[PDB]
């Protein structure tokens, strides 16, 4: 169980409104985290309040976990600090259409 | 007394200007916190300085505890960092009408 | 000497350009602090760079201690982090006219 | 192996879209870091979302590591906090044309 | 060698483009620091990207050490965190004309 700070980036767009921060099955048993850093914008981003949420469970119920909200007219960027995500965790777009570049650091363990 | 980091979100709008971050009575005896993260906006938000306050007591007097202030024209979002709220705690809107999406992390203990 | 985290708010306006964060004389002997959090705006705030300063002494000389600066046209809010004020400490408005809502946390000791 | 906090600055422009934060070969064996601080803009900066990325490897694949994004119309500056870069590391401009002044602190060891 | 947290402020303007954070000769032998906090603006500030740099030496060469950059049109204020300056250290204005109010905390030792 040795550390690697493998940086990570993903895209939430119209045809990728839902995405998964995922670790392979043989590696899920180890301590894996995601230090979330920053979100940028693409060309097709709608000029409205794009909202990025975390999707996990609620004791058997569906849940959206608010993470970020932006709009290129006044807020092209948002600063979220202090979130460590343990895979698997779903990214979802509550509002807007994307694309949004979500960048963080996959802290992974490898044998 | 085991930890759960149950994420949480609430809505402060015209008919919900006052809301309560509350833990059930059988669970109040344990160490419960609320890591406050972020606030977003809804459709009916008035374009003025919405102000979100904490309501607790003042040695027998009513109190508003300033937490956030925003306005979608120039400040659609506000970044509040370092606030842990122990339930029960009231959310109140000092100015504006809402809606405002208040998101944080209910750190709860369960037996 | 037991702690209380008594939250606090004050108003710096035209007729209250100078204000005092003060602890009663029987309680000055204890460790008292002020975790400064946030500043909001009132109705009569002039649309120019309001500046909030701390007033203490300079080995026998008067001093203004820069703390915050804002203007509702582009900066309705300012984020000051890391300031603990030991009472008595004066709030002064170097520029502008107010009103400004200064909110923080009086960490007080009581017997 | 003694520390020096040698401050550092570089320019990413049209003819310098790729740059290298590099330490000399005789000094690579020591613990070298780069506390990244701030990015400013030049005269020829295009008024669009300039994006600065880190270039390293992906287990044999090319990678861009999102670091900053700005645009002088609304975001002339970006605040990136918490990044320590161990040389050699490539700076690349994913979008835009520059120039961009990237400033940080080369924490270097010398014999 | 006893501590004093003597707060400090200085002005970088057209006729004061260069300034010195200095400690008296009889006191230079002690551990002296400057926790840099904040920069505000004056009346004669040009509406362009004012840049504040630190001036020290480069193994016999002149150096400018980027610290802050602002412009009252979109960035009337800049938030620089984590800089402790040991006197003597020169403040210089790389771009712009000032005035700029630089405020921090001279952590000084006195016998």
Residue numbers in the entry:
A (entry chain A), B (entry chain E), C (entry chain D), D (entry chain B), E (entry chain C): 12 to 122
Which passages does the manuscript contain on this structure?
In Xenopus eggs, NPM2 replaces sperm protamines with core histones upon fertilization, thereby promoting nucleosome assembly on sperm DNA Laskey et al., 1978; Philpott et al., 1991; Ohsumi and Katagiri, 1991. NPM2 can also extract out somatic linker histones from chromatin Dimitrov and Wolffe, 1996; Ramos et al., 2005; Bañuelos et al., 2007. The acidic tracts in the C-terminal tail of NPM2 binds H2A-H2B, histone octamers, and the linker histone H5 Platonova et al., 2011; Ramos et al., 2010; Taneva et al., 2009, while poly-glutamylation and hyperphosphorylation of NPM2 promote its substrate sequestration ; Lorton et al., 2023. Our cryo-EM structure strongly suggests that the NPM2 binds to H1.8 as a homo-pentamer.
By further analyzing our cryo-EM structure representing the H1.8-bound state of NPM2, we identified two structural variants, classified as open and closed forms. The major structural differences between the two forms are found at C-terminal and N-terminal segments of NPM2 core and at the A1 loop. In the open form, however, the C-terminal portion of β8 is bent outward to the rim. Along with this β8 bending, C-terminal segment, N-terminal segment, and A1 loop are also positioned outward in the open form. The bending is critical in forming the open-form NPM2 structures and increases the accessibility of the H1-binding sites. Notably, extra cryo-EM densities, which may represent H1.8, are clearly observed in the open form but much less in the closed form near the acidic surface regions proximal to the N terminus of β1 and the C terminus of β8. Supporting this idea, the acidic tract A1 (aa 36–40) and A2 (aa 120–140), which are both implicated in the recognition of basic substrates such as core histones Dutta et al., 2001; Platonova et al., 2011, respectively interact with and are adjacent to the putative H1.8 density. In addition, the NPM2 surface that is in direct contact with the putative H1.8 density is accessible in the open form while it is internalized in the closed form. Structure variation analyses suggest that NPM2 subunits can exhibit two structural configurations, open and closed forms, of which H1.8 is stably associated with only the open form. As the A2 and A3 belong to the disordered C-terminal tail that extends from the petal side of the NPM2 complex, our data suggest that the open form provides a stable association platform by exposing the acidic surface at the petal side for the substrate recognition, while the C-terminal A2 and A3 at the flexible tail may facilitate recruitment and possibly also entrapment of the substrate.
